[PDB]
């Protein structure tokens, strides 16, 4: 804990909901609660494309930062899959990313291995 340094920056995620009220600080733990047959994924992806620091309130921007992500699911449908992919290539931020993919059809057990591997 001594090694950790308190959060202090936040990003613009592009939806007020967060971006006003709750404030997505950098390096935070945010769970997004959903139900089946709701737009679980989509909304996630949005964040992935609008996520960006604010130089304006500072003196430091993306002229001092690149940007990146690492994604994995742990098995999903197919339908969620491809849908996912098309938003990384059209952003093109795919390159600078890592994918672990377990599809919901592999031996079940490797559900518990996978998180950490990526983590």
């Amino acid at each position: 804990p001594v090694a950790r340094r308190k959060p202090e920056q936040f990003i613009q995620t592009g939806i007020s909901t967060i971006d006003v009220m709750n404030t997505l600080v950098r390096g935070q733990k945010l769970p997004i609660f959903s139900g089946s047959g709701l737009p679980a994924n989509e909304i996630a992806a949005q964040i992935a494309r609008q996520a960006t620091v604010r130089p304006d309130l500072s003196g430091e921007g993306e002229k001092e930062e690149p940007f990146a992500v690492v994604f994995a699911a742990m098995g999903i449908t197919q339908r969620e899959l491809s849908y996912f992919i098309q938003e990384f290539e059209r952003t093109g931020a795919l390159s600078r990313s890592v994918l672990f993919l377990n599809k919901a059809d592999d031996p079940t057990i490797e559900r518990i291995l996978t998180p950490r591997m990526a983590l």
Partner: protein, 62 residues
């Protein structure tokens, strides 16, 4: 006589209102068009230009 003088002048000032009235309503139509088009040529400039820079991006990434 004096009867017809008053009738002329009465009718004549009404003439002066019809003619200008049509004209301004024509000009305003004319000028509406100028604006209408301008915002469209701009709008399609915008969209295509971004879809240009971003398009090349996806290539660059390829």
């Amino acid at each position: 006589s004096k009867l017809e003088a008053i009738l002329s002048q009465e009718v004549e000032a009404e003439i002066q209102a019809l003619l200008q009235e049509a004209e301004a309503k024509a000009e305003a139509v004319k000028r509406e068009a100028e604006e209408k088009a301008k915002a469209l040529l701009q709008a399609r400039e915008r969209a295509l230009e971004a879809q240009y820079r971003a398009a090349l991006r996806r290539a660059e990434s390829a």
